Structures are given as structure tokens and as C-alpha cells.
Amino acid sequence: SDTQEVNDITTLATLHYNGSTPADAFEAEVTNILDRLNNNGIPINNKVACQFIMRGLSGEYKFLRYARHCIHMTVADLFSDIHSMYEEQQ
Amino acid sequence: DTQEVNDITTLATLHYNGSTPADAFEAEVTNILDRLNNNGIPINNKVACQFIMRGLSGEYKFLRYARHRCIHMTVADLFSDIHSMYEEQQP
């Protein structure tokens, strides 16, 4: 709590996702972290946030990284794709 | 175009135990904090100090023990202590 920023940044920098947990829940936790960082004066823009998320994608989700080498893609757009892929894996 | 991600990753994974010059450590940490700021991500004194302290090992861990909740310590103050310790370690 004293170290909220450091912990949130660390989490953002070490994200891993390959569809082993629900896409919704992953999305919710990443949104929460991005929102809290912003509220604590550390602005993570769409590009930087997308890069942190993309770099943690493994399994089939790595192909989303390969596909979006996408100028002006939003977190929302990336999360849409992730959810789509997750739904297809069920 | 991944400069911010790289710089934040560096900041989050710092390591210093006196095996390299304190000056060089300080220079690289300053460089990263400056470049982040220039790329619209200012990192305040507290957060910067926490990242540096967390990376201290060997005898430098004792600086973290002494200062973990040292309210309103500056990066400059922390760097001073690290440099002092380094100078004392030199033969």
C-alpha cells in the first residue's frame, strides 16, 4: 500500500496470459492496475499498456502479438481480441 | 518504440551489490528516470527510491533496512549513501 506503485508496475511488467484463466478476470485485473497507476500519478498510455500486455501473451495468444507489431490500437481493442480468442478456445 | 516498457522493466529489476562502480549505477538509474520523464511517465522520489532500495543486495541491503520507511528521503540522498558505502568498500 506504501508500495502500491512499485507492486503495480512490477505486475504490469511481468504479466503472463495463455488462456488458462478467464479472459474477463485477466482483463479486470489489468484494468484495475492501469487505473490505480493513473490514480497514483503514473500514466500508462494505450501503447505502453498494450506492449506490456502483448509481451506476456503465450500459447495461441502470442499470435495476437505477432499481428499487432497496429498504430493507435487501444487496450480495449486488444482485450476484445483476447476475449474473442478465449471464447473460441472453449 | 518500446523505450518506456524497457525503461520501466529496468527500473523494476534493478540490482546493485557493489560489484560495479556506484557512479555507473547512479548514472544509469538517473538516465532511466530522466528518459521516462521525457516520455511522459514521471516517477516521483518515493517510488524511485523504493525501486532502488529493492534492488540493493550484499551489504547494500542494510541501507534498505535503515531507510525502507525513511519519509522524504530523496534519490540524491540515497545515491549519496550508496556512494559512501562503495567508497568504504574499496581497498
UniProtKB/Swiss-Prot annotation, chain A:
Q: How does it assemble?
A: Homotrimer.
As recorded in UniProt, coiled-coil segments are none
Section covered of the full-length record: 261 to 351 of 440
Q: What is known of its domains?
A: The C-terminal RNA-binding region of CA is sufficient for all its nucleocapsid-like chaperone activities.
**Cited function:** Capsid protein (CA) is the structural component of the virus-like particle (VLP), forming the shell that encapsulates the retrotransposons dimeric RNA genome. The particles are assembled from trimer-clustered units and there are holes in the capsid shells that allow for the diffusion of macromolecules. CA also has nucleocapsid-like chaperone activity, promoting primer tRNA(i)-Met annealing to the multipartite primer-binding site (PBS), dimerization of Ty1 RNA and initiation of reverse transcription.
Whichever gene encodes this chain, its name is TY1A-MR1
Q: What induces it?
A: Ty1-MR1 is a weakly expressed element. Induced under amino acid starvation conditions by GCN4.
Q: What else is known?
A: Retrotransposons are mobile genetic entities that are able to replicate via an RNA intermediate and a reverse transcription step. In contrast to retroviruses, retrotransposons are non-infectious, lack an envelope and remain intracellular. Ty1 retrotransposons belong to the copia elements (pseudoviridae).
Spell out the subcellular localization from the entry.
Cytoplasm
Q: What is this protein called?
A: Transposon Ty1-MR1 Gag polyprotein
Q: Upper lineage ranks?
A: Eukaryota, Fungi, Dikarya, Ascomycota, Saccharomycotina
* Source organism per UniProt: Saccharomyces cerevisiae (strain ATCC 204508 / S288c)
